[PDB]
Design an enzyme around this catalytic site. Sequence first.
Site, PDB file in Angstrom:
ATOM      1  N   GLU A   1     -41.010   5.085  21.161  1.00  0.00           N
ATOM      2  CA  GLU A   1     -42.049   4.269  21.787  1.00  0.00           C
ATOM      3  C   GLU A   1     -41.481   2.965  22.349  1.00  0.00           C
ATOM      4  OE1 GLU A   1     -42.316   5.621  18.558  1.00  0.00           O
ATOM      5  OE2 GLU A   1     -43.953   7.038  18.822  1.00  0.00           O
TER       6      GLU A   1
ATOM      7  N   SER B   1     -32.121   1.313  24.010  1.00  0.00           N
ATOM      8  CA  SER B   1     -31.183   1.666  22.931  1.00  0.00           C
ATOM      9  C   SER B   1     -30.243   0.553  22.510  1.00  0.00           C
ATOM     10  CB  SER B   1     -30.266   2.817  23.345  1.00  0.00           C
ATOM     11  OG  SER B   1     -30.945   4.048  23.463  1.00  0.00           O
TER      12      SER B   1
ATOM     13  N   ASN C   1     -31.074   8.545  18.223  1.00  0.00           N
ATOM     14  CA  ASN C   1     -32.412   7.968  17.974  1.00  0.00           C
ATOM     15  C   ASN C   1     -32.885   8.116  16.527  1.00  0.00           C
ATOM     16  OD1 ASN C   1     -33.049   6.872  20.538  1.00  0.00           O
ATOM     17  ND2 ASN C   1     -34.080   8.741  21.229  1.00  0.00           N
TER      18      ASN C   1
ATOM     19  N   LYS D   1     -29.512  -0.965  18.944  1.00  0.00           N
ATOM     20  CA  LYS D   1     -28.811  -0.213  17.895  1.00  0.00           C
ATOM     21  C   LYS D   1     -27.503  -0.872  17.458  1.00  0.00           C
ATOM     22  CE  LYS D   1     -31.062   3.977  19.445  1.00  0.00           C
ATOM     23  NZ  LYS D   1     -31.029   5.091  20.420  1.00  0.00           N
TER      24      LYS D   1
HETATM   25  C1  LIG Z   1     -31.574   4.556  24.513  1.00  0.00           C
HETATM   26  O1  LIG Z   1     -31.888   3.651  25.389  1.00  0.00           O
HETATM   27  N1  LIG Z   1     -31.718   5.869  24.668  1.00  0.00           N
HETATM   28  C2  LIG Z   1     -30.884   6.823  23.891  1.00  0.00           C
HETATM   29  C3  LIG Z   1     -30.394   8.036  24.682  1.00  0.00           C
HETATM   30  N2  LIG Z   1     -29.112   7.521  25.263  1.00  0.00           N
HETATM   31  O2  LIG Z   1     -28.974   6.485  26.250  1.00  0.00           O
HETATM   32  S1  LIG Z   1     -27.994   5.295  26.129  1.00  0.00           S
HETATM   33  O3  LIG Z   1     -27.960   4.601  27.422  1.00  0.00           O
HETATM   34  O4  LIG Z   1     -26.651   5.725  25.716  1.00  0.00           O
HETATM   35  O5  LIG Z   1     -28.464   4.373  25.119  1.00  0.00           O
HETATM   36  C4  LIG Z   1     -31.260   8.390  25.937  1.00  0.00           C
HETATM   37  C5  LIG Z   1     -32.039   7.222  26.617  1.00  0.00           C
HETATM   38  C6  LIG Z   1     -32.830   6.434  25.610  1.00  0.00           C
HETATM   39  C7  LIG Z   1     -33.814   7.032  24.738  1.00  0.00           C
HETATM   40  N3  LIG Z   1     -34.608   7.509  24.034  1.00  0.00           N
END
Ligand SMILES: *C(=O)N1C[C@H](NOS(=O)(=O)O)CC[C@H]1C#N
Length: 268
Positions: free
Chosen positions: A146, A48, A110, A51
Amino acid sequence: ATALTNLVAEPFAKLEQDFGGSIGVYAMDTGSGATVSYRAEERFPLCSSFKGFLAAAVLARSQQQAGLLDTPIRYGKNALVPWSPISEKYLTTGMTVAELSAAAVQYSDNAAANLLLKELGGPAGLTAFMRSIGDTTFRLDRWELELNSAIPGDARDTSSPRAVTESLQKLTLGSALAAPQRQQFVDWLKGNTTGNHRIRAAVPADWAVGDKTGTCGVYGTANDYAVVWPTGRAPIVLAVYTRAPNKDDKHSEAVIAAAARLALEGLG
Ligand SMILES: *C(=O)N1C[C@H](NOS(=O)(=O)O)CC[C@H]1C#N
């Protein structure tokens, strides 16, 4: 004489051995130019954490496209994928590009990330933005979810701790973006809700922190990057990334916080 990088590095080696994986760290003291570096040029999955850079890329586009941040994106039900807690609330109205950007950064939404990728020309478009600021390491290849596969030896959807830190510095503290956009990026990072147990946990409560986390959900792969503003001092930029060889190796927020503390304490 130069730093004895073996002595700087030692505690990260001990930490990653108990963790059962690899830890990558780069920290930059913008006051003195001091750095801490451990596996800083190795590749780790972004998960993530892409982002934050996605939001920066949106901000860059808004400098050429007046009012882009105000633009409503009115999405359908097939935009909704798991871990989209903000975009799932607004199906009946849509959301603005600004709202989507805030959600992608601060809740790691997401669907919001996927919608913003579509606006920028996909994973390729985000990668092209990173190339435009001199980041030759960053690559985003795939979409949510993915891109979280984190398969050992896969170069797709990775960067290095050093490249992440250098690009973060350029975008938050340097003038890569215009001042209004720069401060917006900073404000989005400062309002993150997902990072309290990572770099933030190593920082005194009276110091401002902006961060973005990543948690792939497999292969002990998770991360955080941040800007830290110590009171009356030059800010620090840092990144901590982990991975591990087995799909069922646990990630650890405590390991990220501990690596962050070792990095911060080791500067200058
Ligand atoms: C990103 O890596 N994510 C988004 C969601 N949150 O986790 S985060 O550590 O705050 O970024 C769950 C895990 C994963 C996915 N899809």
